[PDB]
Design a protein around this ligand. Sequence first.
Ligand code: HEM
Length: 291
Amino acid sequence: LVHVASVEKGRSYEDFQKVYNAIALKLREDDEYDNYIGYGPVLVRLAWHISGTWDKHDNTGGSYGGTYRFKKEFNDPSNAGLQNGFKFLEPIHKEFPWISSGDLFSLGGVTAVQEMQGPKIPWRCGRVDTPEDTTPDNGRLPDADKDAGYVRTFFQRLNMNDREVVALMGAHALGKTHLKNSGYEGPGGAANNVFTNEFYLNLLNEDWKLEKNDANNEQWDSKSGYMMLPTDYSLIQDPKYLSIVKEYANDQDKFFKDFSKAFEKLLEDGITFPKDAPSPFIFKTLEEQGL
Ligand code: HEM
């Protein structure tokens, strides 16, 4: 498979900035979702899940085809809870019916990060909706009950190295696990709808205790009311992952620079950009626009 990016016919930067502004105005407005966390964290989990299906060996999966719209992907056990993010984006797709699905699902993750005060993520348009039979089978997304070796090996399929896995994992400062979606319960920090390096500071400064939860799964819990998944706690058990955690715990700007680069790479894997294609767009936030 090759997947060539094709710009939506006749669309330029200003059209995409209007789709970004529509997502971001609706984030401001529907602030009550999930105990006033708001939809920003489930929107960056939807952009990572429609991208995380990619396989570097045969070029299948990834964000290009927008195949989450199909039942098989939508109903994947690992995607439980993402229907909430889908339902959010749906009025915005009726309002801009020209944007492809993979372009809308991935821009939602870009808008969410930047509106939650995170780094600017460059975004490229050009994903094309592909047919129902291009939809990846369930099972390509990661398990949480595992160790640092599993993590390294899993992310190699999407060819992410150590620095990219640890930067990418910092998004677990956001939102929370929900027992009915994943068998895990609780948040990773206090500021869970603002993008900061808090996940690394909690992982290095809290007194974590291993406990089973009401679903019979293990997680690392702290006195403060936070939790860490096994795969999260892995990052301090591995010597290589541990120096990087320390680095970001001490430098939020390095974390932001590295998260920006890795998350754009995750969103573009499996896609070929012709050099006639437009350069990546840097979208202004509502605040930068006075809106
Ligand atoms: C080995 C890797 C990963 C595993 C096992 C994993 C697993 C999970 C699990 C079990 C949840 C809770 C789902 C729920 O109950 O609603 C979760 C939530 C979340 N994940 Fe991950 N994750 C991984 C990687 C990532 C990456 C790379 C990103 C983003 C770049 C990410 C972003 C999020 C976000 C933002 C949430 C919170 C969503 C919400 O509040 O509803 N995760 N993850």
